[PDB]
Amino acid sequence: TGLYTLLSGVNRHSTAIGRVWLSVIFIFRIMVLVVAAESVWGDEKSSFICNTLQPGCNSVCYDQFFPISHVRLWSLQLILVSTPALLVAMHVAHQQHIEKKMISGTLWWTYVISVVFRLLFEAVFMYVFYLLYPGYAMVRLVKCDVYPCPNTVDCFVSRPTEKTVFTVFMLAASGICIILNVAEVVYLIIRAC
Amino acid sequence: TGLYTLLSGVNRHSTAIGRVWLSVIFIFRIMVLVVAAESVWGDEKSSFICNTLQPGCNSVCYDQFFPISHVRLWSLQLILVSTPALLVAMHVAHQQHIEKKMISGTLWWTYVISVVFRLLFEAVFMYVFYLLYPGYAMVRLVKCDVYPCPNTVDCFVSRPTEKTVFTVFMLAASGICIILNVAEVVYLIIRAC
Amino acid sequence: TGLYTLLSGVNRHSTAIGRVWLSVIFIFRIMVLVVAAESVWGDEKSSFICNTLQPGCNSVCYDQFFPISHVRLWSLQLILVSTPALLVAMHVAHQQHIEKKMISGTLWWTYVISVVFRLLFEAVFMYVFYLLYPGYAMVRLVKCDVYPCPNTVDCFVSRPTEKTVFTVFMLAASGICIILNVAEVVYLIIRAC
Amino acid sequence: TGLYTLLSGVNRHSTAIGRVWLSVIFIFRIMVLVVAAESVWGDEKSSFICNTLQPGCNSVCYDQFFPISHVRLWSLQLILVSTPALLVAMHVAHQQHIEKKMISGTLWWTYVISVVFRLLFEAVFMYVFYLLYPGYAMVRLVKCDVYPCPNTVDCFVSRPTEKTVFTVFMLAASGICIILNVAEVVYLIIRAC
Amino acid sequence: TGLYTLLSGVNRHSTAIGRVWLSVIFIFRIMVLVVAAESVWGDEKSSFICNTLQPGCNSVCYDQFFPISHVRLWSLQLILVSTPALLVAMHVAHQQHIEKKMISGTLWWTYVISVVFRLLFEAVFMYVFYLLYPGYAMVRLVKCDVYPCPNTVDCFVSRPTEKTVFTVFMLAASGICIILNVAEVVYLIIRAC
Amino acid sequence: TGLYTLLSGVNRHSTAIGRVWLSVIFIFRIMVLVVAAESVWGDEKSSFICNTLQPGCNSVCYDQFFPISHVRLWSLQLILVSTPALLVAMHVAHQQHIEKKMISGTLWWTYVISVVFRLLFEAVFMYVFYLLYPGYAMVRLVKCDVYPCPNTVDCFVSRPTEKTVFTVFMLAASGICIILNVAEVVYLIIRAC
């Protein structure tokens, strides 16, 4: 769990919000994603079927309705959110090594910039999820008219309800993280002056 | 096992009940879930079949009768139950770091609040399991009339008896945990006055 | 292997029988179960076939003849047998922590009670295995008349001979463990007076 | 993560660019590849289908259109890029062992040569990717006329859009790495004189 | 590798033969078994087919011709061969603990008895392999007349040649181990007098 | 990576060639084999198809044309090449233990003998690969006339081009290793006199 707290963004300049609350939500998102990755999204494409005899209609309809899986989006979001924290950690390690082989304001500014970048990454991933999948709920039946499917065909999604439940969990966690990051930057600015 | 005892909620203010009994039941639930996750619930959907020629009826009937798998419910319950313990642990680490870089009542109140939250999470997960699956036993044959299935169709469940056995084990463990948490809060309150 | 010896029940009051013989048999059972879990019992249900055209007869016949797999029974037996040892270990750790932050008879009684509980768990699992599967051998062909199968159908089991061999190994190991536990309690009682 | 930073090429003569920026991009590429390896490229061939009754046409068309998978190309690129860094590390360990059992310019020249070799490997892998797959986007339908397929047949690709997204990510990361390596060699040369 | 050398039977009374040669062959057998377990024996039963329309003939013929897989036999042989070494190690640990909380001949006799038991286990497993599979080579086609197969049917084995190669490797390694154990006991007896 | 360098054959008498160059090539071969084992050779037999209705022709033709897979050959080669290095390491550990409980020429001769044995193993595996697969390239279509296939049938290979690429990589690495071993023995002999 120490690696997870390192990836969260725990810093010596971090207050209680960034040190005890943000890291726990980060670990919670990691655990939920690990639980839901291959158990419920594993057969998303192999169990996707359409009512037709046309060869190749299943693959094109699946690609049309799921340009990128929810799990891959969440994985990319977690990686990009954790990147600035380890960037700051490597910078601190470099500074300590330089000190050993031979200010605090630079650390403070680096921390606030990294928090701002985390907030931006979370916001943009929320926006792209809203663009791709406007509704938080997943439906059982979809209508597909992409070539080579003739006219319109009915296709059926695997495990819509369980996927909806996990989507609600993940979106709520992301929203909480956004609120906590905004509170963190505001608190740091207030403490500065 | 040390990580498991940390996730259980072992604290310096914990009595014998919370330190030697609750953690063991937590580890027992973890081990049973690990044993039963993919061995018996792995083919829940791929082996689910219905007596019909209608395309898409298997998937919609499976989604209707199993909105969320038992294993996923137990995994979410374990994650949410273990969250407050590591929240308390991170708060203790933060307090110790603050002391290093420069009371007991706060620790006591944090511990009692975390125990209450664990009790609430266990109770709400028991209630939601009762709502979704009223009977502890799983049946071999189910009747499905969801669109697009015509009229009513017969569908067959994989491994009903083994799933019933593991459900009984998990429910008994959860009930024991609830009783132990109630005893813990009562004992702490009694020792307080 | 140290974790396995801890799970066996090695204690400072343990004699040679409980310290050098019981733990080795415990590790042997763990290793045999790990070898045989998914190699030979992996396709128990997917390769189970019956001579019929009736939909759903394979699943109901498999559920009728295998209410719970042998591997899951052995896993549950190992978990329940190892539970009292780690309960005792956690109690000892709690006692030592209490001593650090500030008798032998309590340890002796706890050890004998844990050994008795291990003996009881092994005996009850042997009895339930005898109830479910009276014969140690597994047959190639079974006769199934459960609804919806019409009349009686023939069904065929995967790898009967290899499963029989591993069943003999596991039963012999369990019997040896029972005998050793009885010898342990008798020896401790004799040394007491 | 320490092994990853070692494989990146962190050296005592490295500046900030090579120590805190290049290593993070290396770890980012590793993580994205781990996420995308078997999740989205796992069923590239088993789900590849063509509209024909000719036996063997699926395999020959897949081999014609995908001589080597994107994931394998990226894996080989990462291995070859990380080779000179560990070569330098082993040379440093050998030099230190020789010193223990009994100049800086040799280390400086070895570092600059290793950086040049990393730049060359990244450039050649970019060029070979451009040769094999000129467009960054993947199409849904391809036309195949390789023997034994009669005339021309239509074949359908699995998950074109998700693969396009991950390809864009990987190409952008590789370009950033190339730019950073060029900046590193230029900065080292400038500091030399 | 330290655990492997412990399982081999390295003891303070061991000579060069038992300390540097037997352990290497043990590790070699472990590595070859790990390589060949699921790569070449993984599809032994799923790819086994017979030329018939009779339901259930494939399973009964496979069970008749392969009562227990070669890989499972080798796994059991390795476990049973490694058991006496860890029994001796646990006895030594028990003796040292007894010394700490408060002769060499006992250690010498325990070592020679354990070597004899290892020799016996290897010999009996060689004999049982000879009984089950008289020829070291595996054939492509087998003739099966077990009920319910009508008359005699032809069945085909997966990867006969690769399995033959690995069988030759494993048998040669086992024979070398037997010879080395005999040399070890003879050398110890000679050194005794 | 330390275990890999130990398996390479790094010794206190090793020069730069054996200490910094041979070990890197060994690790490179290990990594390439790990990447290519199950990704590209995983479906070698399940996707192998022939244009016929004869039962059992696919398996016999696959066995005829691929007596042993390339990946298994490379795995065996790596194991046998790494065996003498760990034999020498265990001999050194035995010598140091003997010294602790109570010359350099023996170490020198052991090192040169181990290098010669590594060279011999690499050469013989190269020769056997040349015998089994004379051409470095793999073809799409093969002609099979083994019983029970009637007359001659066409069979199709999975991923010929990617397998050719990885074969070229592995053969080049093995040739480099052979050249480096010859240079090592020549350099040691020259330094001796």
DSSP line for chain D: -HHHHHHHT--TT--HIIIIIHHHHHHHHHHHHHHHHHHHSTTTTTT-EES---TTHHHHHHHHH-SS-HHHHHHHHHHHHHHHHHHHHHHHHHHHHHHHH--HHHHHHHHHHHHHHHHHHHHHHHHHHHHH--SSS--SEEEE--TTS-S-EEEE-S-HHHHHHHHHHHHHHHHHHHHHHHHHHHHHHHHH-
**What's the rounded Cα separation, in Å, for the pair D51 and F174?**
43
Of C126, C137, C134, C143, residue with least CA distance to C162: C137
DSSP for residue A153: E
| CB contact (8 A) between residue D20 and residue A94 | yes
The token duo for A128 is: 């792209």
Q: Are strands B153-156 and D153-156 parallel, antiparallel or unpaired?
A: unpaired
| CB contact (8 A) between residue E79 and residue C157 | no
Instruction: Identify all chain F residues contacting E160, using CB atoms and an 8 Å cutoff.
Output: 63
Neighbours of F93 (CB within 10 A): 14
DSSP for residue A145: -
Query: Subunits that touch chain F (at least 3 Cβ pairs < 8 angstroms)?
Result: D, E
Distances (CA, A) of E148 to C49, C145, D59, E56, F47: 13, 19, 38, 7, 31
Transcribe D29-76 into DSSP letters.
Answer: HHHHHHHHHHHHSTTTTTT-EES---TTHHHHHHHHH-SS-HHHHHHH
**Phi, psi for residue B55 in degrees, rounded to 5:** -65, 135
Nearest to E154 among F56, F79, F83 (CB): F56
Distances (CA, A) of D47 to A69, B98, C89, D50: 17, 57, 52, 10
DSSP for residue B147: T
Interface contacts A/B by beta carbons within 8 Å: 76
Cβ burial C105-129 (10 Å sphere, 16+ → b, else e): eebeebbbebbebbbebbeebbeeb
Between the two ends of chain A, the Cα-to-Cα distance in Å is 34
**What's the rounded Cα separation, in Å, for the pair A85 and A181?**
13
Would you say E12 and E30 are in contact if contact means Cβ atoms under 8 Å apart?
no
- From chain F residues 9-28, the ones with a CB under 8 A of any chain E CB are none
The token duo for A2 is: 């120490």
- What element of type H or E holds A35? helix A22-40
D87 touches chain F (CB under 8 A): yes
| CB contact (8 A) between residue D76 and residue F35 | yes
Cα of D26 to nearest chain F Cα, Å: 17
- From chain D residues 151-180, the ones with a CB under 8 A of any chain A CB are 154, 156-162, 165, 169
B69 touches chain A (CB under 8 A): yes
Distances (CA, A) of F102 to F94, F95, F97, F98, F99: 12, 11, 9, 6, 5
Instruction: Identify all chain E residues contacting C162, using CB atoms and an 8 Å cutoff.
Output: 67-69, 72
Would you say B83 and A24 are in contact if contact means Cβ atoms under 8 Å apart?
yes
At E139 the three-state DSSP class reads coil
Of F38, F40, D157, residue with least CA distance to A45: D157
Residue of D nearest to A84 (CA): D24
Cα of F152 to nearest chain D Cα, Å: 15
Cα of B124 to nearest chain C Cα, Å: 27
DSSP for residue E136: S
Instruction: Identify all chain F residues contacting E157, using CB atoms and an 8 Å cutoff.
Output: 59
Contact residues for C53 (Cβ-Cβ < 8 A; gap 6+): none
Contact residues for C50 (Cβ-Cβ < 8 A; gap 6+): C57, C58, C61, C144, C149, C153, C154, C155, C156, E55
Neighbours of D139 (CB within 10 A): 11
Instruction: Identify all chain B residues contacting A36, using CB atoms and an 8 Å cutoff.
Output: 72
DSSP for residue C42: T
Counting every residue written for chain A, the total comes to 193
| CB contact (8 A) between residue A24 and residue B83 | yes
Residue of D nearest to A77 (CA): D32
Nearest to D63 among F36, F154, F160 (CB): F160
Counting every residue written for chain C, the total comes to 193
Cα R_g (chain A), whole angstroms: 21
The token duo for C186 is: 């008798």
| CB contact (8 A) between residue C63 and residue B20 | no
Instruction: Identify all chain D residues contacting A147, using CB atoms and an 8 Å cutoff.
Output: 141
At E49 the three-state DSSP class reads strand
Would you say D48 and F43 are in contact if contact means Cβ atoms under 8 Å apart?
no
At C135 the three-state DSSP class reads coil
| CB contact (8 A) between residue D94 and residue F19 | yes
Query: Subunits that touch chain E (at least 3 Cβ pairs < 8 angstroms)?
Result: C, F
Q: Give residue E170's identity as a one-letter amino acid code.
A: M
Give the dihedral sign, CA C88/C92/C93/C98.
positive
SS3 per-residue string spanning E147-166 = CCCCCCEEEECCCHHHHHHH
The CB-side HSE value for E96 (13 A sphere, CA atoms) comes to 6
* DSSP H stretches of helix in F46-151: 57-65, 70-101, 104-132
Overall resolution, Å:
2.3
| CB contact (8 A) between residue B161 and residue C83 | no
E75 touches chain F (CB under 8 A): no
- What element of type H or E holds F144? strand F141-144
At B151 the three-state DSSP class reads coil
| CB contact (8 A) between residue D20 and residue A90 | yes
Q: Are B and A close enough to touch, i.e. 3+ CB pairs under 8 angstroms?
A: yes
**What's the rounded Cα separation, in Å, for the pair B142 and B159?**
14
Cα R_g (chain F), whole angstroms: 21
Would you say E148 and E56 are in contact if contact means Cβ atoms under 8 Å apart?
yes
Of F37, F33, F27, residue with least CA distance to F7: F27
| Percent helix, percent strand, percent coil in chain A, to nearest 5 | 70, 5, 25
The token duo for C178 is: 């029972």
Would you say E37 and F84 are in contact if contact means Cβ atoms under 8 Å apart?
no
Counting every residue written for chain D, the total comes to 193
Q: Give residue D35's identity as a one-letter amino acid code.
A: V
| CB contact (8 A) between residue D63 and residue F159 | yes
Would you say B159 and C45 are in contact if contact means Cβ atoms under 8 Å apart?
yes
Would you say F8 and F23 are in contact if contact means Cβ atoms under 8 Å apart?
yes
Cα R_g (chain B), whole angstroms: 21
| CB contact (8 A) between residue F63 and residue E36 | no
Neighbours of D128 (CB within 10 A): 14
Nearest to D72 among F39, F50, F160 (CB): F39
Helices (H) and strands (E) in chain F, counts: 7, 3
Q: Cα dihedral angle (A171, A172, A177, A179), rounded to 10 degrees? A: 120
Residue of C nearest to E42 (CA): C39
Of F137, F140, A56, residue with least CA distance to D149: F140
Counting every residue written for chain E, the total comes to 193
Cα of C80 to nearest chain B Cα, Å: 8
Query: Subunits that touch chain B (at least 3 Cβ pairs < 8 angstroms)?
Result: A, C
Please state how this structure was obtained: cryo-EM
Q: Are strands B141-144 and F141-144 parallel, antiparallel or unpaired?
A: unpaired
**What's the rounded Cα separation, in Å, for the pair C28 and A170?**
43
Contact residues for B41 (Cβ-Cβ < 8 A; gap 6+): B69, B70, B71, B163
**What's the rounded Cα separation, in Å, for the pair A58 and A155?**
8
* DSSP H stretches of helix in B19-159: 22-40, 57-65, 70-101, 104-132
Counting every residue written for chain B, the total comes to 193
Instruction: Identify all chain B residues contacting A157, using CB atoms and an 8 Å cutoff.
Output: 59
Contact residues for C30 (Cβ-Cβ < 8 A; gap 6+): C4, C78
Give the dihedral sign, CA A56/A58/A64/A67.
negative
**What's the rounded Cα separation, in Å, for the pair D71 and D51?**
27
At E122 the three-state DSSP class reads helix
The token duo for C183 is: 């010898």
The number of angstroms, rounded, from the C-alpha of B107 to the middle of its chain's C-alpha atoms is 26
The token duo for F105 is: 């020429």
**What's the rounded Cα separation, in Å, for the pair E122 and E117?**
9
**What's the rounded Cα separation, in Å, for the pair E47 and F46?**
9
